[PDB]
Design a protein that fits this description.
Radius of gyration: 37 Å
Strand order of the largest sheet: 12-13-11-10-16-17
Keywords: The RNP Complex 3, RNA binding protein
Entry title: Crystal structure of the Cas12i1-crRNA binary complex
Oligomer: 1 chain of a larger assembly
PDB class: rna binding protein
Name: 12i1
Organism: Lachnospiraceae bacterium ND2006
Length: 1057
RNA sequence: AUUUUUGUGCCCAUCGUUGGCACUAUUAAGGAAUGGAA
């Protein structure tokens, strides 16, 4: 009914007096050893659950009652823990022994679920419970009664209450003798004499009954047909009928010895930090096991042979590599269902060789088999490329071992085996959520939490005037209560930290009167709408320019903040006790994290829908569609009316010498200014130009590495692209020379570390760039394997391993170190793309809201949504980290502003969809065309068209739109298939132009597999040109832009009623 | 309650002209793809 999202604010604990700091240090220290016992004990508290205790409880999201008990009786911890371990057999009988019922089918999976046999084992919590009543020696029924109550206040099982609340019921209600009516009603009885008024028909006595409505029915006819001496007796008896915690006191006292004197703030803080894992794990593992068998059950589990033989290629001759690392097989390999088509062709020519083999079937020439051999690969090679051309690329080497057993297994079975393999292989390898208390951290909320409060901005300049200090200091201050161990008292103290980002965001204060009003978002973000670009003043420039390089960057963000406040450009920020301080201490370092909660009623009635495509493979594109559109351009979608407001590529330009440098678009500088570095890398190759390759057909061919390198080294080419392609080339050359595996030691470092334009030095955000790193990692890893091996091959029990990495780094720590560093930047480099894409998506999303209204962001991601029923595997995995991360980030970001909503959506194969044309009212598919000059048209393109039009039947409904385009091709220019055949490309481009000169046109286009040009019914591209394709008017625009709109269209109607 | 030298990151043939940017925290596991064009 309301959005509740709080933003975190990281800060640098600012060291103070060594002694002062130490006081906090211990306080922190004591707490740590304090909450751990609660975690070990509350464990036991959950280890005594009773079937009767849960009786009538229910309120479980479709959760087997028996199953729930299983997670509290005992869980999985570490091998060496306080509680006693258990066996993966008696386990099933224990539940039956404890509950008098063979374990349900939901709790049976939990026990079956895998876990670290190496470092973990299940531990009986019920035993520790019996053990719990051992030392405490509390009465079984006593404890059980007390316990039973705990479950009523959700202090056990699931949906537990606030830590403080649980600490205000167990060790709360501080009153020596002050209960519901202890010193109030009891004193009233003696007060009757004090006032000496006849205690008959007192109006106040009636009001409880009168305000609240046998005995009670006899009070309504009290004197209508003054007894009040029966009410007292009844009250005493009614008060004696009620009961409260009895076993609690022994428990409280026990803690004291270990935990220490009890305080709500601590006794409650220590518990919250301790019980976080317990509650989480239970909820988590429970959710996990709930859906664990969800697919596992109905999920086909019978084609093991298919999967078993499918992988046989991993252990087949086909699988050859250095790292010897087996990767999970998937449907995407083999073009999935697509590969079905190609089998026929293979067998068709296979039979032929078998037939041609009959006619010349003699030991005279075995070259036929070798030639039939090479021919095959080529087909696969084209087939893998072709299919990958517009959809990744299936493994061609894996297809070699897949055909090997042609008669072995069937084609359909293989596809069925791949799907089965896909789930079981990994889906089943999801291990069990173990429960272990990790580093804790207590915060200081305004109220109903640990005593605490951050220096007020109104009392910051008011208390600074008393000390006569600079009206403002770039340092945040805060004060909270704490416990001095030595004195065991409740004292207070002041400490401050400087989160620069937080100063500008919402801490720095605007002194000037009539300053700008705060934004709804309440944060000084440029996205929120504060450029924060104040005119850098005279002294400020001196302040920046003259400062040291190190802090030089921070001071700049420092001087701009003060100038904005000086020029009154600093918008006012509303302030409240809405900040929670989170303090965590590691070593002598304390990681303080402050964040506030944000709430905003959801904008359910949206009039603008924005869909984005964060595709790692293709360029990112943003599209916004107006909902309930009314205007000159309107399209009725399924009796729903809208128009496309705008469509554009997501670009992140970076100010550099007055030149926009897109982080996702850049791919390196021109090889013209990269001549010196290029020459050195080129000089390296000459020594090792000798290498062995493999013919497209399959016969390995030996070639000079340089020739490929030369084509690679051109001024027009980019340094980034060449840098990857170099490693790929560098990979292979060193491969041909495993002997000199330590001879490429220097070059590598230069190439990715000390090198002038090292991959580490310069790193773009373009898809190709991340490519360098992955390819980068392979090369270094590829170096060790060839570098680390025994001279003799296939000996001493099939060679040996690469001594992990732990003992494999000893060979070259620097090298190993580089990889860590290389990875290190990649992860941060990966984060950047995610956070950055969100800002731009949000912004344009936000921009639209301001001009049109509340808008929805349609995103392609598979959320942990309810897909119970029918799910599609093709759409199962079509989004990588970028797609996921962005969507999740956006969904996280959307929490900040009003009128913004984020909806996840199963990824689809929308690559040839038509704007406001698909599923409206019927489905309309088209082909991917590409425009280009007649001057440069390769044979590949010339033969590409032939592929589609080739008279070949295909039951599978795929590539049918391509043929129509081809036909459309001919008819469009009014030509004939045979009017052009085997005319190379010299007489092929000559024909168009005459046909192009007659229509006075240029750069003709055609349907290309995975092109950048598409024919759309509507103008989805502002620069899109209008043209009639085969007598049909269409809007020429970039396919990427069209894709964005398609994503937005998917199930748009479901979110409008 | 005075520290006044820093919250975390990203981009670049010219690490600076005030170069140009973006971000919610711990934690958890895992983390399969030889493509460049203002």
């Amino acid at each position: 009914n309301a959005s509740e999202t709080r933003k975190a604010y990281t800060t640098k604990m600012i060291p103070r007096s060594h002694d002062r700091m130490k006081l906090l240090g211990n306080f922190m220290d004591y707490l740590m050893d304090g909450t751990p016992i609660f975690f070990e004990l509350w464990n036991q508290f959950g280890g005594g659950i009773d079937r009767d205790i849960i009786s009538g409880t229910a309120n479980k999201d479709k959760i087997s009652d028996d199953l729930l008990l299983a997670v509290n009786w005992f869980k999985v911890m570490p091998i060496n823990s306080k509680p006693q371990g258990v066996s993966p057999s008696n386990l099933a009988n224990l539940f039956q022994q404890y509950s008098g019922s063979e374990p349900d089918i939901q709790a049976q999976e939990y026990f079956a679920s895998n876990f670290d046999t190496e470092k973990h084992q299940w531990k009986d919590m019920r035993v520790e419970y019996e053990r719990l009543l051992a030392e405490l020696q509390l009465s079984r029924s006593d404890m059980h009664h007390d316990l039973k109550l705990m479950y009523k206040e959700k202090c056990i099982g699931l949906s537990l209450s606030t830590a403080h609340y649980i600490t205000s019921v167990m060790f709360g209600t501080g009153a020596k003798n002050n209960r519901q009516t202890k010193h109030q009603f009891y004193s009233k009885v003696i007060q009757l004499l004090e006032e000496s008024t006849q205690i008959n028909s007192v109006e106040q006595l009636a009001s409880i009954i009168l305000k609240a409505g046998p005995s009670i029915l006899k009070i309504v006819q009290d004197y209508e047909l003054p007894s009040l001496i029966a009410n007292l007796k009844e009250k005493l008896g009614r008060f004696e009928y009620e009961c409260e915690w009895k076993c609690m006191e022994k428990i409280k006292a026990f803690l004291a010895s270990k935990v220490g004197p009890y305080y709500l703030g601590s006794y409650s803080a220590m518990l919250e930090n301790a019980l976080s894992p317990i509650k989480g794990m239970t909820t988590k593992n429970c959710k996990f096991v709930l859906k664990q068998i969800d697919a596992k059950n109905d999920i086909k589990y019978e084609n093991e042979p298919f999967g078993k033989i499918v992988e046989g290629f991993f252990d087949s001759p086909y699988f050859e590599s250095d790292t010897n690392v087996k990767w999970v097989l998937h449907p995407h390999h083999i073009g999935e269902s697509n590969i079905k088509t190609l089998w026929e062709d293979l067998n068709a020519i296979h039979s032929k060789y078998e037939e041609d083999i009959a006619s010349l079937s003699e030991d005279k020439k075995e070259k036929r088999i070798k030639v039939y051999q090479g021919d095959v690969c080529q087909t696969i090679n084209t087939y893998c490329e072709e299919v990958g051309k517009e959809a990744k690329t299936p493994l061609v080497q894996l297809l070699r071992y897949l055909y090997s057993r042609k008669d072995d297994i069937a084609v359909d079975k293989i596809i069925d085996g791949i799907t089965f393999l896909s789930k079981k292989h990994k889906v089943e390898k999801q291990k069990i959520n173990p429960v272990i208390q990790k580093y804790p951290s207590f915060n200081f909320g305004n109220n109903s939490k640990l005593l605490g409060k951050i220096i007020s901005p109104k009392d910051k300049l008011k208390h600074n005037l008393k000390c006569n200090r600079n009206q403002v200091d770039n340092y945040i201050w805060i004060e909270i209560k704490v416990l001095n161990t030595k004195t065991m008292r409740w004292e207070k103290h002041h400490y401050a930290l400087s989160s620069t980002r937080f100063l500008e965001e919402v801490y720095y204060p605007a002194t000037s009167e009539n300053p700008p009003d705060a934004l709804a978002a309440r944060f000084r973000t440029k996205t929120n709408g504060y450029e924060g670009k104040p005119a850098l003043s005279a002294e400020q420039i001196e302040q920046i320019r003259s400062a040291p390089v190190g802090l030089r960057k921070v001071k700049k963000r420092q001087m701009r903040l003060e100038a904005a406040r000086q020029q009154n450009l600093l918008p006012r920020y509303t302030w409240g006790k809405d900040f929670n301080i989170n303090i965590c201490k590691r070593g002598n370092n304390f990681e303080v994290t402050l964040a506030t909660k944000v709430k905003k009623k959801k904008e359910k009635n949206y009039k603008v829908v924005l869909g984005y495509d964060a595709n790692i493979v293709r360029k990112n594109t943003y599209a916004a569609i107006e909902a309930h559109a009314n205007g000159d351009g309107v399209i009725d979608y399924n009796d729903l009316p809208v128009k496309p407001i705008e469509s554009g590529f997501v670009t992140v330009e970076s100010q550099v010498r007055d030149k926009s440098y897109d982080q996702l678009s850049y791919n390196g500088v021109k090889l013209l200014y990269c001549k010196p570095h290029v020459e050195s890398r080129r000089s390296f190759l000459e020594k090792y130009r000798n290498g062995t390759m493999k013919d497209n057909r399959g016969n390995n061919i030996q070639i000079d590495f340089m020739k490929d390198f030369e084509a690679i080294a051109d001024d027009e080419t980019s340094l980034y692209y060449f840098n990857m392609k170099y490693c790929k080339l560098l990979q292979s050359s060193i491969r041909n020379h495993s002997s000199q595996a330590k001879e490429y030691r220097e070059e590598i470092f230069e190439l990715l570390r000390d090198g002038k334009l090292s991959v580490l030095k310069l790193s773009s955000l373009s898809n190709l760039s991340f490519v360098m790193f992955k390819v980068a990692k392979s090369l270094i890893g590829t170096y060790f394997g060839h570098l680390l091996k025994k001279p003799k091959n296939s000996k001493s029990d099939v060679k040996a391993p690469p001594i992990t990495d732990e003992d494999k780094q000893k060979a070259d720590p620097e090298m190993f170190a580089l990889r860590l560093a290389l990875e290190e930047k990649r992860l941060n480099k990966v984060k950047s793309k995610k956070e950055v894409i969100a800002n731009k998506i949000v912004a344009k999303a936000l921009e639209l809201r301001d001009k049109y209204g509340p808008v929805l962001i349609k995103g392609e991601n598979i959320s942990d949504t309810t897909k119970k029923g029918k799910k599609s595997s093709t759409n199962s995995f079509l989004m990588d980290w970028l797609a996921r991360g962005v969507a999740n980030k956006v969904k996280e970001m959307v929490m900040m502003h009003q009128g913004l909503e984020f909806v996840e959506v199963n990824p689809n194969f929308t690559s040839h969809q038509d704007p406001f044309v698909h599923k409206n009212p019927e489905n309309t598919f088209r082909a991917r065309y590409s425009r280009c000059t007649p001057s440069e048209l390769t044979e590949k393109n010339r033969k590409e068209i032939l592929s589609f039009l080739s008279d070949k039947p295909s039951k599978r409904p795929t590539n049918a739109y391509y043929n129509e385009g081809a036909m459309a091709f001919l008819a469009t220019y009014g030509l004939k298939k045979n009017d052009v055949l085997g005319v190379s490309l010299e007489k092929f481009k000559q024909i168009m132009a005459n046909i192009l000169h007659q229509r006075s046109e240029d750069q003709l286009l055609f349907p290309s597999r995975g092109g950048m040009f598409y024919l759309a019914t509507y103008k989805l591209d502002a620069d899109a040109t209008s043209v009639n394709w085969n007598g049909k008017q269409f809007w020429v625009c970039n396919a990427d832009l069209v894709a964005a709109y398609n994503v937005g269209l998917v199930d748009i109607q479901k979110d409008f009623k």
